[PDB]
Amino acid sequence: DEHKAHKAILAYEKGWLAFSLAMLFVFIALIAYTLATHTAGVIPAGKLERVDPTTVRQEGPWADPAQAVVQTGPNQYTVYVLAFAFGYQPNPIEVPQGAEIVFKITSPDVIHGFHVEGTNINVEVLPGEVSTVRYTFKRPGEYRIICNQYCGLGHQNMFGTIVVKE
Amino acid sequence: EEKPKGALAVILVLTLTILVFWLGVYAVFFARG
Amino acid sequence: VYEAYPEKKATLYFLVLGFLALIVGSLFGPFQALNYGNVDAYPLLKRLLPFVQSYYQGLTLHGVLNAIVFTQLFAQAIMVYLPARELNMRPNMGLMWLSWWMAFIGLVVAALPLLANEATVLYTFYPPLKGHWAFYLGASVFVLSTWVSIYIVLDLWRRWKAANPGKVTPLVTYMAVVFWLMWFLASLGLVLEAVLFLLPWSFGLVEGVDPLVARTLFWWTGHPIVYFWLLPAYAIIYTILPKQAGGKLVSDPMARLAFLLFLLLSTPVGFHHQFADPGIDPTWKMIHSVLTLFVAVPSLMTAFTVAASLEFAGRLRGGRGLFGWIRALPWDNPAFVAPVLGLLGFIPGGAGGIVNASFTLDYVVHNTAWVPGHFHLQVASLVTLTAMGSLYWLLPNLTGKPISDAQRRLGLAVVWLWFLGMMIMAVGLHWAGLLNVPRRAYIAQVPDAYPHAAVPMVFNVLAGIVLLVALLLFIYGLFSVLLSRERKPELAEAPLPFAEVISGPEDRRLVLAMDRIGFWFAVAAILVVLAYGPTLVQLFGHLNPVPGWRLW
Numbered sequence: 001d002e003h004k005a006h007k008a009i010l011a012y013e014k015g016w017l018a019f020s021l022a023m024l025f026v027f028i029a030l031i032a033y034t035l036a037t038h039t040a041g042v043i044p045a046g047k048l049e050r051v052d053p054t055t056v057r058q059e060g061p062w063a064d065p066a067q068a069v070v071q072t073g074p075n076q077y078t079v080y081v082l083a084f085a086f087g088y089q090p091n092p093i094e095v096p097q098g099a100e101i102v103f104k105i106t107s108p109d110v111i112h113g114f115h116v117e118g119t120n121i122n123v124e125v126l127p128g129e130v131s132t133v134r135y136t137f138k139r140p141g142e143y144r145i146i147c148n149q150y151c152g153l154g155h156q157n158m159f160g161t162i163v164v165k166e
Numbered sequence: 167e168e169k170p171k172g173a174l175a176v177i178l179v180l181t182l183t184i185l186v187f188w189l190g191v192y193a194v195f196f197a198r199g
Numbered sequence: 200v201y202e203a204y205p206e207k208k209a210t211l212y213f214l215v216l217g218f219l220a221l222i223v224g225s226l227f228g229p230f231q232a233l234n235y236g237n238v239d240a241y242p243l244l245k246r247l248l249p250f251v252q253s254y255y256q257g258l259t260l261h262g263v264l265n266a267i268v269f270t271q272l273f274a275q276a277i278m279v280y281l282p283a284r285e286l287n288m289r290p291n292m293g294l295m296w297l298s299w300w301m302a303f304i305g306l307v308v309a310a311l312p313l314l315a316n317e318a319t320v321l322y323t324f325y326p327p328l329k330g331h332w333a334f335y336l337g338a339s340v341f342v343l344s345t346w347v348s349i350y351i352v353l354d355l356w357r358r359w360k361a362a363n364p365g366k367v368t369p370l371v372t373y374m375a376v377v378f379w380l381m382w383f384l385a386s387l388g389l390v391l392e393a394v395l396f397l398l399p400w401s402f403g404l405v406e407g408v409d410p411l412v413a414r415t416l417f418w419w420t421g422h423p424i425v426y427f428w429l430l431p432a433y434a435i436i437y438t439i440l441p442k443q444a445g446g447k448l449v450s451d452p453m454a455r456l457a458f459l460l461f462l463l464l465s466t467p468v469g470f471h472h473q474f475a476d477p478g479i480d481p482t483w484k485m486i487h488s489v490l491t492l493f494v495a496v497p498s499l500m501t502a503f504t505v506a507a508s509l510e511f512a513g514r515l516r517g518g519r520g521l522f523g524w525i526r527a528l529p530w531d532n533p534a535f536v537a538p539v540l541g542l543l544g545f546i547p548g549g550a551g552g553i554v555n556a557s558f559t560l561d562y563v564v565h566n567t568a569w570v571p572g573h574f575h576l577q578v579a580s581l582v583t584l585t586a587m588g589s590l591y592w593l594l595p596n597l598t599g600k601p602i603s604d605a606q607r608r609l610g611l612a613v614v615w616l617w618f619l620g621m622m623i624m625a626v627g628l629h630w631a632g633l634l635n636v637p638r639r640a641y642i643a644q645v646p647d648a649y650p651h652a653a654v655p656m657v658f659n660v661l662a663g664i665v666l667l668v669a670l671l672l673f674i675y676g677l678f679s680v681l682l683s684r685e686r687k688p689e690l691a692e693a694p695l696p697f698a699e700v701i702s703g704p705e706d707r708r709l710v711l712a713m714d715r716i717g718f719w720f721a722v723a724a725i726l727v728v729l730a731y732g733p734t735l736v737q738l739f740g741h742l743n744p745v746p747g748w749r750l751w
C-alpha cells in the first residue's frame with residue numbers, strides 16, 4: 001500500500017499516454033485527409049500578394065465593382081471583393097453554382113472578417129494584403145456574409161450577400 | 167491498494183467528450199464543404 | 200509577519216490589485232451575456248457608468264482587466280510566493296517591490312486612455328486600429344514587470360542551488376523555474392511588436408504598421424500567454440489541492456514532466472490563431488497544428504495525475520466503489536470545491552480547444568461565439584475559480600485574519616453559482632457559434648439578425664443573471680474577508696498547506712534528466728527558431744506597413 005498504488009498509477013500513466021498519442025495521430029490523419037480533397041480550397045493561399053490599401057479603390061481590380069467577377073477558367077471565376085468599414089463590394093456578389101469561385105479579398109481600412117454563412121469560407125481580411133480563397137457552391141440562393149473581426153463601432157452591422165445563380 | 171477506477175472513469179469521460187466535439191465538428195465541416 | 204516574511208506583504212499587494220482588476224473587468228460580463236441573449240442592457244449600464252461610450256469600450260475593458268491584468272498579477276503572486284515559502288528563502292525585496300510598482304504604474308498609465316475611450320481596440324489591439332500611445336506604453340511597462348519577476352525566481356533558484364550542490368530542484372521551484380523560463384521565451388513576440396512597431400507608431404515616429412507581422416508577433420506571445428494564465432493554477436492543483444482533498448500528489452515526476460512539456464511546446468504553435476490568415480504558408484500551419492496537438496498532451500497527463508490524487512484522497516476518507524471517493528471529498532471546503540469544479544468545466548473546455556487546433560476544422564468556428572465559449576471554460580472558470588478558491592487558504596496565510604463559518608459558506612455559494620453560470624454560458628456561446636454567431640459583436644442592437652439562435656440566447660440571458668449574482672456575492676465576500684479587524688497572527692505564521700508527494704525508485708533518473716534546465720531551455724528556444732524563423736524572415740523581407748485608423 002501507498003507504494004503499491006505508485007507502480008500501478010505510473011503504469012496506467014504510460015497506457016493513457018500511448019493511447020492519447022494514437023488518438024491524436026488519428027486526428028492528424030483525418031486532417032491530412034481534408035487537405036487532400038476539394039474542401040482544402042478554403043485554406044488561404046500562402047504566397048504574399050501585396051497591395052496598397054489607399055489606392056485599392058481608385059486603380060486596379062477592386063476599383064470598379066462592375067468588374068469584380070471575371071471568368072478565369074472554363075469553370076473558374078475570380079471575384080475581386082473589397083471588405084471595408086461597414087460593408088462589402090460588390091453588393092451582392094453574384095456567381096454561378098457548380099463553378100470554382102476564387103475569392104481575392106482585401107480591405108482599404110482595417111482588418112475585417114469574411115465569413116460566408118453556411119460554408120467553410122472564413123478568412124481574415126488584411127489591409128495591404130490579398131486573401132485568396134477557393135470554393136464551389138453546390139446549392140444556389142442567397143448566402144449571407146458576416147464580418148467576424150471587430151472593425152469599429154458599426155461592426156455588428158457589417159453584412160454582405162452572395163447570390164449564386166442556379 | 168490498487169487500480170485507479172476513479173481516474174480511469176475521469177479520463178474515459180474526458181475521452182468521450184473529445185470524440186463528441188471533434189467528430190461533431192468534423193461532420194459540420196464536411197456538411198459545409 | 201511582515202518583517203521576517205515581507206514577501207507576504209508584497210504578495211498580498213499583487214493579489215489585491217489583481218482581484219480589484221477582476222471585479223472592475225467582470226462588471227461588464229453580465230451585460231455582454233445579455234447582449235448575447237439579444238437583450239440590450241447598455242443604456243442601464245451607461246446610466247450607472249457615465250464614462251462608458253460603447254459596447255466595444257466595455258469589451259476592451261473586460262478583456263484587458265480580466266484576461267491580461269488579473270491573470271498576470273495572480274501568476275506573479277503565486278509563481279514567486281509559493282517557491283519562496285517552499286524554499287524558505289526571501290526574494291530580493293528591492294526587486295520585488297519594483298515589479299509591483301511597474302505593474303501598478305503600467306496599469307494606471309494604460310487605464311486612463313481606456314477609461315477616456317482613446318483605446319477601444321480590445322485586448323488584441325490589432326493594427327491598423329490605433330489607440331492612444333499611453334495604452335501601448337502602459338501595457339508594455341505592465342508586461343515588462345514580469346521580466347523582473349522572472350529574475351527574482353531565477354535568483355532564488357540560483358541561491359538554493361548554491362546552498363544545495365548536487366540536489367534536485369524542489370518541485371514547486373522546479374515548476375516556477377520552467378514556468379518563468381517559458382514565459383520569457385514567450386513574451387519576446389509581444390515585446391518585439393511593441394518595440395519595433397506599436398510604440399514608434401503611437402508616438403508618431405512612423406505612419407504605418409504591417410498588419411500581418413503585427414499579428415504574427417502577437418500570436419507568438421498570445422498562445423503561451425494562456426499557459427501563463429493556466430500554470431499558476433496547475434501549480435496549486437498539483438501541490439496544494441491534494442492536501443485540501445485529504446490526500447497526496449500521487450506523482451512528483453509526472454508533474455515535472457507535464458511542466459517540462461509546457462516549457463517545450465507552449466510557444467511554437469501560434470499559427471493556430473492564424474489559420475484564417477493570408478500570407479502564411481499552409482505547410483507551416485499544419486506543422487503548427489501538430490505541435491498544438493502535442494501541447495494538449497501535458498493537460499491530458501495532468502487529468503490523470505490530478506484525478507488519481509483526488510481518488511486516492513477520497514479513498515483515504517473512506518471512499519467506496521467506482522464513485523464513492525467523489526462523495527467522500529470535503530465538499531464543505533471552498534478551497535477544495537473551487538478548483539474541482541474548474542476542472543470539470545475544463546473537460547468540455549479542452550475538447551473545444553482540440554477542435555480549434557485541427558487546422559481546417561477551425562474554419563467552422565473561428566471568430567464565432569464558440570471561441571468565447573471555449574475560453575471561458577478555460578480561464579474564466581478553471582483559472583478564476585482556482586484563484587477565488589485559494590483565498591480560503593492563501594489570504595489567511597498572508598494576513599492572519601482567519602475565515603468564519605459564515606464566510607466559508609458565502610464562498611461556496613459564490614463558487615457554485617459562478618461554476619454553473621459559466622457552464623450555462625458555455626452552452627449558449629458554443630451553440631450560438633455553431634449557428635455562426637460572430638464574436639466581438641453588439642448583436643442585441645441588431646435584434647433580427649440572428650433569429651435562428653433563439654434558444655441558446657435564452658441560456659446567455661440566464662447566465663447573465665446568474666453570474667450577476669455570483670459576482671456581487673463575490674464582491675461582498677471578498678471585502679468582508681479584507682475589511683474585518685479579526686487578526687490572529689499565529690496562522691499568518693502557519694505554513695502553506697503543501698501536499699506530500701508519493702515518490703518511487705524509478706524517479707531518481709527521470710527527475711535528474713528533467714532537472715537539466717539549461718539544456719531544456721535551449722531546446723525550447725531552438726523550437727521557436729525553427730517554427731517561426733522561416734516565416735518571420737519572409738515577412739520581414741516584404742514589409743507592407745499601412746496607416747492606422749480610429750473607428751470608434
Ligand code: HAS
Pocket residue numbers: 176180323425426428429471472491492494495496498499501502503505506509525539542543545546548549550551552553554555556557561564565566570573574577578582
Ligand atoms: C486559460 C486559458 C486557456 C487554456 C488553458 C486554453 C487551452 C487550449 N486552447 Fe484555447 N484555443 C485554441 C486551442 C487550445 C488548445 C489545443 C488548448 C489545450 O491547451 C487544452 C488542453 C486541455 C485538455 C487536454 C483537457 C484535460 C482536462 C483536465 C486537466 C481536467 C480533468 C478533470 C478533473 C481531474 C476533475 C475530476 C474530479 C472529480 C471529482 C470527478 C485554439 C486553436 O488551436 C484557439 C483559436 C481559436 C480561433 O479560431 O481563434 C484558441 C482560442 C483561445 C482564446 C482566444 C484568443 C482570442 O481572443 O482570439 C483564449 C483566451 C483561449 C484560452 C485558453 N485556451 N483559447
Ligand code: HEM
Pocket residue numbers: 225226227228229230231232235258259261262263265266269270321322323571575578579580583637638639640641662663666667670
Ligand atoms: C462576470 C463573469 C463573466 C461574464 C458574464 C463574461 C461574459 C463574456 C461574454 C458574453 C463575452 C463575449 C463578448 C463578445 O464576443 O463580444 C466575453 C468575453 C471575454 N471574456 Fe468574459 N465574462 C466573464 C468573466 C470573465 C473572466 C473572469 C475572464 C478572464 C479572467 C474573462 C475573459 C474574457 C475575454 C478575454 C473576452 C473577449 C475579449 C475580446 O474578444 O476582445 N471573462 N465575456
Ligand code: CUA
Pocket residue numbers: 084085086111112113147148149150151152155156158
Ligand atoms: Cu468589418 Cu467587423
Ligand SMILES: [Cu+]
Pocket residue numbers: 421422423425471472
Ligand atoms: Cu492558442
